[PDB]
């Protein structure tokens, strides 16, 4: 009994979401920071920023330094989840368009460094749809570093349509700085909302405080903040908005599949947690499209941790047993088994 | 005991064609049994021939005779799914994989041979019908192929007599509908969606969509359904024979013609497959016609149709294809029911 | 069945240390801020926030229902700040408890059960005399001066050598330096005359001299040297020989190099010209309280000194425990 | 599990400072719990603890244990049987008795607090002022609360050795005190009757930091009290100033023998003296009791027919139990006192 329980770690650009399989919540979410004990990982470093040079291992969703990323794993398995991984099977999450190396870097790591009993890498945007319970659709993942619009059909993505934007949460916050300091006055992102028509809204152009400083009125900068996603012009990026990135994406597909896509548009990520992005992605996509098709925009509320939910719902599956990689396989086919088994 | 059930979990596929049964069932046996080298090689030879109905017999009979060394789940479940297996030239995706892997394996055999001088001579046999605009002597294969891929310059107008010799070329299924362009991963496996190993993914290229007009009586996809795509009856092969006959006429009692011509034909066959233009079963089928055999009978030449002895490598990767193809379908099913068991 | 483990928690003014019994290693050490600290100068002042440190302790850091729990307490704690420790664990946390004096725990770590221990933490520096492994009420002496304050001092002193460590992250820099570079000097005065993060300072011997003389800070209290003697002379002449020969430095702020030789000297001269003075400093003094508790929780006999859940069925904390 | 409370006594009954007293206290708990009709036995043995008859009752306990060995165990009887022959007591290290008695006094006080009419003490004044007028008390017209009654009753120290000497001499017992004449000093402490300053008190039984005297026992006085009566907790002497209560009382007995309630009123006083003196640390139950229980001092009560209950309450249970708890812990934490004084010796 007690078939061992799996651990799922969404290695994101901004935070690390870890938990155990068959759960409805991430047990521990912590920043992906390794500051440098011979190192400090996690919120602890955030506390000792003073004498430590913080570095972020995952940049734009993909792993740049593997020396510190190994430490977001000792920490995760060992000190934020307090489990030895040798015992427990470990799924990992991966970003769209992940190069080959990183998929072979992971396998090396957790089966050699961590001697896990099983591994598995998956596109983070697929798992997101898995929460919605769909197997075919368009998932607009919006993390803190990278927002993508990845089409998924019958369980698989179409690498040719995966579209990317280097605009994100970190960025909106950063942009907001300009404007807040531009009003002559950490942040109240929990008051910002995406308008249906920014221009009308700007033609109407609430109370936030902490003890130090002062009570502050959230300016017209509230909708301007997420309007960066829609018009990245505010950030002076000519890269197309989220409305467009999505449409353009849909059309890099065979015209047979699109209807499904237009009707299965999942919005994923915390940058999509803004109220009202729902009605906007819609108004905007409907405009760019055959009036006949159905545009359904689907935003579930567990979205911030959607990636995780689907992953649990996947490792918490009896039929996932076969898919995992047994250590011997690795011991046989090397790390290449990643491609042969994790398609 | 974990491996047996998996293939029992793969045998519930709604979309399993015939080419998919063989691969998993042999895989079921490759583990259950483990002196049987004569069977598995004979399954590959038939699989290359697309002669699966004879193979299935051998597989269903190999179980009765060796049911003692297996389990009863294997021995029932095959003879339960075998008579309900119909091929489909559109959804045959495993098959396409096999042959794209052989196209890379047969050109390496001709990259292993050093005389690519047969090709130069042909140009002099090319210039008699209609250089090839090339001034770098034919030295590598990337120019031998290009010059042979150039035979498309011999258009309908110069191959048409042979088109009026065939009784099968009139019966062609390609639809006159201009469906446009698909950014594919691989070319033999044109589809937008196929899990593809990082072993077999290549630069994004745009490949045409092909439509079968199924109205035709006696059309190729109909008569022989094992061959995928819409089955590629190649009309551009007739223009090859113009040069080939003419090559037989000018260079004739060559001690090594039967060797020299198989180099030209196989490579032609393996260039056309790798690049997505056509499928093996159809390059071959055009040439099988009696008036096209005759020409090689007039010089006593026997056509080695791209057949290789050591195709285990390509066989196995299709098992790993269908295995992951089938199982992921099963988890996909599970999710659908459990989530629809959430609403 | 397995022998389920017990848990050891030293709820501190500045840092909490939890781990698991027997382990040579405390598993977790974590700032207690909830930003509001529950424990005050050694005595819990806001209990509610401390209930939270506990949730984190039992659950988030360590991952109660089947594990026994030994919270640690302080010398001369108001005792109603004892029953409550009993109540929350048994009731809110339905633990299957024993509360101990940190000091007793340190001496215990020493491997002995009688002496006088100096425990400088961040909230309070206590000099407690323990005999027969018992905290002695008539002699316990304390000082509301301790490490946290010393960090502040390093701030001011540098504040005038010109470096400035104003920010919060910057404050941690100061703590980092105090923790290591600065030291206790054997002859302060000679060393403030040899005078005449590593941006260097000559305020290395003065920061810990504040422990010996709190005048810098502006506190009217005697140096830890004397809180010790004083406390001693409130002990039976008879047991003094031992207390003098069993003095253990403990607590984190005693990690300043060289407090030992000094404690010996200052006391020595203050001491009876004839007694035997011995100071025992463990290198693990940082965490000596905990280790002390692990041993115990793993002692076979202590197993009945605990409190049954049915025995609980909060005034048993005075009568079954010390 | 309960077998850790049984082992605990198997292990508490093995300490090197266990004596006659602690055995009786722990055993009963052990019987009261090993078993779960036998109510009398914990009262019969109890009565004897207040009388310091640890001797007979140990044995009766260990007779019940065997007779009811059926509902008890081989181990408890074995152990219990091994420890008893080898038992002695030391006043200096007899400290469970002291808690009991310290707690008993507070019990005899509420009793006296429940005894309303405190006029009895006021009248006593008119007898003191005629014993040592030169030191006459001249205070509240009425002693209204026991705290007032207690302080004055503690003022008989004013009656010098001079008005008591006719009485101290005839005793054969008083010449046998063993308080050394070495003035050892004062030592600060947490509980008064349990003078030992290093005693494991419960935080509930803690009083302010008061400075208690250190007294020494001159072991060489032939016939030392401590030698004759070792169960009595700390005794270097016998209650001298009791001889003074008697002067004030001899003059009172004879003046109010006319009253019919003197039987009550004399015990109200003697009981209060016994209580406050034990609470305040001056003496021990028996130090005071053995004096008035003297041939010459009992005559006065005989002449006027007074029967004294020298403060003997038969509901001394709460006090018993509380002490049973004392030893329990005292014994475990002082038996590991050496588990770590032996593990440590395995590091060196």
Residue numbers in the entry:
A (entry chain B): 2 to 37, 50 to 198, 211 to 230, 238 to 375
B (entry chain J): 22 to 55, 59 to 154, 158 to 370
C (entry chain A): 2 to 35, 67 to 95, 98 to 130, 132 to 231, 247 to 363, 367 to 375
D (entry chain H): 20 to 55, 59 to 370
Paper passage:
The intracellular bacterial pathogen Legionella pneumophila modulates host cell functions by secreting multiple effectors with diverse biochemical activities. In particular, effectors of the SidE family interfere with host protein ubiquitination in a process that involves production of phosphoribosyl ubiquitin (PR-Ub). Here, we show that effector LnaB converts PR-Ub into ADP-ribosylated ubiquitin, which is further processed to ADP-ribose and functional ubiquitin by the (ADP-ribosyl)hydrolase MavL, thus maintaining ubiquitin homeostasis in infected cells. The activity of LnaB requires a motif consisting of Ser, His and Glu (SHxxxE) present in a large family of toxins from diverse bacterial pathogens.
To analyze the catalytic mechanism of LnaB, we solved the crystal structure of the LnaB19-371-Actin complex, which had activity indistinguishable from that of full-length protein. The asymmetric unit (ASU) of the structure contains five LnaB19-371 and six Actin molecules, which form three LnaB19-371-Actin heterodimeric complex. In the LnaB19-371-Actin complex, Actin mainly docks onto the carboxyl helix α14 of LnaB19-371 with an interface area of 1763.9 Å2. The structure of LnaB contains fourteen helixes and a long loop that folds into two subdomains: The N-terminal domain (NTD) and the catalytic domain (CD). A structural homology search of LnaB19-371 with the DaLi server did not yield any significant hits, suggesting that it is a novel folding protein. In interface 1, T225 of LnaB engages by hydrogen-bonding interaction with K113 and R116 of Actin; N220 of LnaB forms hydrogen bonds with A170 and Y169 of Actin; T209 of LnaB contacts residues E286 of Actin via a hydrogen bond. Substitution of T225, E361, or L362 with alanine indeed reduced LnaB activity toward PR-Ub.
